[PDB]
RNA sequence: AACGCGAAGAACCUUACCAAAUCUUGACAUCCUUUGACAACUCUAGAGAUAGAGCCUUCCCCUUCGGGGGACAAAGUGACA
RNA sequence: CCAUCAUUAAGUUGGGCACUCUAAGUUGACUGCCGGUGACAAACCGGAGGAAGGUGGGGAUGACGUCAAAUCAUCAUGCCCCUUAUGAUUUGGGCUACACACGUGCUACAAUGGACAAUACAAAGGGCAGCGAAACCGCGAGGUCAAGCAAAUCCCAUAAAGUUGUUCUCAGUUCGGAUUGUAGUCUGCAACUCGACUACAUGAAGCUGGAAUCGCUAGUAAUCGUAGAUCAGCAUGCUACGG
């Protein structure tokens, strides 16, 4: 995770360049745990598989500081 | 269970990060010695039996 | 108590090695070729009165010495089976040159033989206490000094395991002078595994 | 010339040092004899129990006994011991020229 | 800004928000102050030359304004780094068993 | 006077977790008048014969062990508490012979 | 005249010599008070030649090796004690009865496994 | 071996400055956590203030101050059960030396000043003048062991 | 005499657990039969294993005919794993 | 490994100084040797004799046996069970969750300290593309190549505590540094779940702890730092090491 090559999943970047040309579709079933959020991802909706059930989330413009896997929870905590 | 994991090891993985080690007769992976490639159980066994070359017992 | 095995005290102190080679670089992989041909020699011989083997390696002429309490059976008929062994032993490794065999007198005073031949007196399931006493009474008759042997589990055919040892003679397990030799066999009786230890001296 | 003599046993590396110091003085040599390098031991500390127990363990060690032989009178009779391979049992010889 | 007197200036500028052991080097760079300046320092003509270098810094209170909204931005996106603020969670991937007390 | 309970191949209920403290707990609370200790309850099922219950309570000097090999895990503790209450009285009358009339010279 | 003795204590060898002159030590070619740290144990280090009273007699100039400062000291007073018995050989009973000439008697003890460090067993809760 | 017999007690090395065994034993008891030099320097700067606040040399003042510390009766507990179990027993000369050194240091650590530059030397001149805090617990032992005098 | 113990190295692997995606002579071993004799390498589709094509159709000896021994396993079950 | 020779950058180089040291192959400590009043009954008690003295210190070695003690998850096999699965194959979780409750340790709650400058002294062990110097370029974690080498020499590696001097002045203050945002350093297909440091910020509990309880008889308690096995990366653990 150096300056040299901020990491992209790159099996997802190929699937999002077809989306941003014309009118976007509102689902990409993916895993996206490895990749970061850079401004070629805004608007699109990803169903991030948290191990159990793929959770939809769409990308805002304040999301560029963080990466894509940090959103779908895997704990299932609520409990006490 | 055991020989599936032995078969998983000896094939070449996709990644050098996986780089997984076990023993040649001990099924366990979890106590290897990379000069001996033996588990701690049988290395205790075949050094008492002397099948390994020169290795004293103890009491330096 | 937790008696450790009597060979492990004495390897190099009052004994020598069952493998006497050296390899600084690539010590790991060509150590595995030893217990390849420690399994493999123990496969097709299949109690040809084999006590133990020795391995020595020098300049891709790697030696194997076997003791063979019944000599000639590994040799065959005038160098037949000894040449029929190097037809496979030289294929499992590269060279396996200068395969040979020496002989031993007193066929059942080496403890590897003494444990094995009365462990094979357990698949016929006949009188384990005499199977003990056959080994003790013959021992110092043939020239031994101290004898000690036991059988551990599923003793006699019952449910609860019971050790059962018989002894006489000087068996100094704590004295580092002593040439104690032990062995452990894996006699199955189709209701579990019986374990049998022996202890010979001189 | 620095003939490297290293081995696991100490009775074997000493009797094989007596071979090379004998089979060189018979030739035209001026042998600086065997001086003992320090032994490069290594301790392996396994634990004794089959399943559980620490706090009760058996230590293991293996010792290499290093010596070196050097000659500064190279004749073709001195190298007859160098070309002549003897005691190959548990000693390696790293012959440098 | 609101620094206390009667102590050395290498520890005195530490008392405000936003300075720890940078007054030993960074404030000492621009201003020609020394290490042994007590209350008796006459730092009024030197008050101006530290005012020029502290004006570039975010230190005196206004950093805590940006520090507060960085958490508020972080919880509004509802990240795992942000849920741990709003939920007493240690945030930086720590073991939340027995010895996790300072977040309660 | 905690109860680190654990059952070998038996799922512990909560009706046991109140029946323990009434008999194993309370009948030894009035013994040991300065108490700070931990109990230990094993329940080991054996499919061939029965279950067994082991209760060990260590103290300052002498511990307290008892075993029953019954299968009823409510009637067996009626005998564990019987063996526990006997062993405490052995401990106390051992140390309640302080009352010895010894007049110094 | 160079009466060269050796001396060991606590995994630190110390070889000395005895050139005549006066009492002046040159441990590792430098002054003692700038090498040995706090000057207390130097008057305990002068105890071996005190009983032969050769104060203004011998310069020593030790080359010491290994150990620490109380391992380098207490090994040159044992160092010159082997050298004082080839200076005053009849004065052996003066050093045998009082201190210096005994030995390197004891070093650090082996760390046994299954233990914290060197015979100190670790704490357990339930007695 | 404390039941085969008695342990053979060992010799110490006297100080170079005062030429006293008693000074070195004070060095070893103020030696917190094995630091010999960093504690010996403090004692060598805790008798100069003694020799500053009194003209006498401190090797006289030390053995004069500890005599107001060293008690002559103490309490050894004998397991008599229902009795008082506190027998007033006089002090052996080895424990007589040690237990005075113990009280001199253990109450030097509980004064107002922080440096043992003058934590130590203040209590010495108090013990030289038969006052302070390490003297007054000797009298507390001499009001406890001398109150239960029915077990001589 | 359990509790920095099996763990002398849990991001993936380990991993035995769970949720998914798809396999049944099984990723492994053995007789084996035709030994069909490497799909021994790249593009495309893909969480990804896998799937579809482009493909190094062989490998050594010794007869004389093209077999047997090591030849890869595409299919097989008496079996077995 | 350099007393005596010097051209000491120290090449510890020239010679070899081989002497000491060190590193390895062997000679020697047992109540052998005396005196006790001590009577013979061995011991004990006190000497001298060697460097060592009373099984020298320590390790290895654990009798008959006890606990149906602990592992059918290192293995191995009696019996039972499973066979479109209770076996497989993948990336994605989890083993790292938490209002909590006991174990075991680390760092502390300071002016026998803290911060900054100087200046010493070790042992053990590792280095099969691994250890990577001296230079640089970075505040730093570190990057770029060659210098050496498969090693008593080359490297990890300048141990640290100490000592010397300047400081703060006795407050939750220059005590420590938990926790949160800024560096993106490095390893690795990839550090979000879920790493490792350092960089400027922020600075919380904490003023030596109740009843109770544990370790330890000399190079031992105590402390200080260095190594290795695991390991691509990662210990406050473990195992060895000396001060």
From Swiss-Prot, chain B:
Q: Which UniProt keywords apply?
A: Metal-binding, Ribonucleoprotein, Ribosomal protein, RNA-binding, rRNA-binding, Zinc
Biological process, per Gene Ontology: translation
> Per UniProt, what is one Pfam family of this protein?
Ribosomal_S14
Molecular function via GO:
rRNA binding; structural constituent of ribosome; zinc ion binding
Cellular component terms per the entry's GO annotation: small ribosomal subunit
Query: Do you know which InterPro entries this protein is assigned to?
Result: Ribosomal_uS14 (IPR001209), Ribosomal_uS14_bact (IPR023053), Ribosomal_uS14_CS (IPR018271), Ribosomal_uS14_sf (IPR043140)
Q: What is the free-text note on the cofactor?
A: Binds 1 zinc ion per subunit.
Cofactor(s) essential for the protein: Zn(2+)
- Cite the binding residues for Zn(2+): 23, 26, 39, 42
Q: Which HAMAP family match?
A: Ribosomal_uS14_2_B
Name the PANTHER family on file. Answer: 30S RIBOSOMAL PROTEIN S14 (PTHR19836), SMALL RIBOSOMAL SUBUNIT PROTEIN US14B (PTHR19836:SF26)
Q: How does this protein assemble?
A: Part of the 30S ribosomal subunit. Contacts proteins S3 and S10.
Tell me the function of this protein.
Binds 16S rRNA, required for the assembly of 30S particles and may also be responsible for determining the conformation of the 16S rRNA at the A site.
Q: Give the UniProt family note.
A: Belongs to the universal ribosomal protein uS14 family. Zinc-binding uS14 subfamily.
Protein name per UniProt: Small ribosomal subunit protein uS14B
Originating organism: Staphylococcus aureus (strain bovine RF122 / ET3-1)
Record gene name: rpsZ
Swiss-Prot record, chain C:
PROSITE patterns, per database record: KH_TYPE_2 (PS50823), RIBOSOMAL_S3 (PS00548)
Name-wise, this protein is: Small ribosomal subunit protein uS3
What GO biological process terms does the UniProt entry carry, in alphabetical order?
Answer: translation
Quaternary structure, per UniProt, is:
Part of the 30S ribosomal subunit. Forms a tight complex with proteins S10 and S14.
Q: Start and end of every KH type-2 domain?
A: 37-105
Superkingdom of this protein's organism: Bacteria
Originating species:
Staphylococcus aureus (strain bovine RF122 / ET3-1)
Q: Which Gene3D superfamilies match?
A: 3.30.300.20, Ribosomal protein S3, C-terminal domain
Ranked from the top, the taxonomy reads: Bacteria, Bacillati, Bacillota, Bacilli, Bacillales
Question: Which terms does the record give in the GO molecular function aspect?
Answer: mRNA binding; rRNA binding; structural constituent of ribosome
InterPro entries referenced in this protein's UniProt entry, alphabetically: KH_dom, KH_dom-like_a/b, KH_dom_type_2, KH_sf_prok-type, Ribosomal_S3_C_sf, Ribosomal_uS3_bac-typ, Ribosomal_uS3_C, Ribosomal_uS3_CS
Swiss-Prot record, chain D:
BP GO terms, sorted? translation
Which InterPro entries does this one have?
A: Ribosomal_uS10 (IPR001848), Ribosomal_uS10_CS (IPR018268), Ribosomal_uS10_dom (IPR027486), Ribosomal_uS10_dom_sf (IPR036838)
Where in the sequence is the signal peptide annotated?
Answer: none
Which terms in the GO cellular component ontology are assigned? Answer: ribonucleoprotein complex; ribosome
Q: Which residues form each disulfide bond in the chain?
A: none
Q: Which PROSITE patterns does the record cross-reference, listed alphabetically?
A: RIBOSOMAL_S10 (PS00361)
Mind telling me which Gene3D superfamilies this protein's record contains? Ribosomal protein S10 domain
Q: Name one Pfam family in it.
A: Ribosomal_S10
Molecular function (GO) terms listed?
A: structural constituent of ribosome; tRNA binding
Keyword list (alphabetical) reads: Ribonucleoprotein, Ribosomal protein
Q: Which HAMAP family match?
A: Ribosomal_uS10
Q: Which PANTHER family does the protein's record reference?
A: 30S RIBOSOMAL PROTEIN S10 FAMILY MEMBER
User: According to its UniProt entry, what is the function of this protein?
Assistant: Involved in the binding of tRNA to the ribosomes.
Question: What quaternary arrangement does the UniProt entry report?
Answer: Part of the 30S ribosomal subunit.
Q: Which family does it belong to?
A: Belongs to the universal ribosomal protein uS10 family.
Q: What is this protein called?
A: Small ribosomal subunit protein uS10
Curated annotation (Swiss-Prot), chain E:
GO cellular component terms listed in the entry, alphabetical order: cytosol; small ribosomal subunit
- In the UniProt record, the signal sequence range is none
Picking any one GO biological process from the record gives: translation
Q: Does the keyword Protein biosynthesis apply?
A: no
Q: Which UniProt keywords apply?
A: Ribonucleoprotein, Ribosomal protein, RNA-binding, rRNA-binding, tRNA-binding
The molecular function GO annotations come to: rRNA binding; structural constituent of ribosome; tRNA binding
Gene3D superfamilies per UniProt: 1.10.8.50, 30s ribosomal protein s13, domain 2
A UniProt-annotated Pfam family: Ribosomal_S13
Note the InterPro entries from the entry. Rbsml_uS13_C, Ribosomal_uS13, Ribosomal_uS13-like_H2TH, Ribosomal_uS13_bac-type, Ribosomal_uS13_CS
Q: Where is this region: Disordered?
A: 85-104
Q: Which family does it belong to?
A: Belongs to the universal ribosomal protein uS13 family.
Subunit note: Part of the 30S ribosomal subunit. Forms a loose heterodimer with protein S19. Forms two bridges to the 50S subunit in the 70S ribosome.
The protein's job, in short, is: Located at the top of the head of the 30S subunit, it contacts several helices of the 16S rRNA. In the 70S ribosome it contacts the 23S rRNA (bridge B1a) and protein L5 of the 50S subunit (bridge B1b), connecting the 2 subunits; these bridges are implicated in subunit movement. Contacts the tRNAs in the A and P-sites.
Q: What is this protein called?
A: Small ribosomal subunit protein uS13
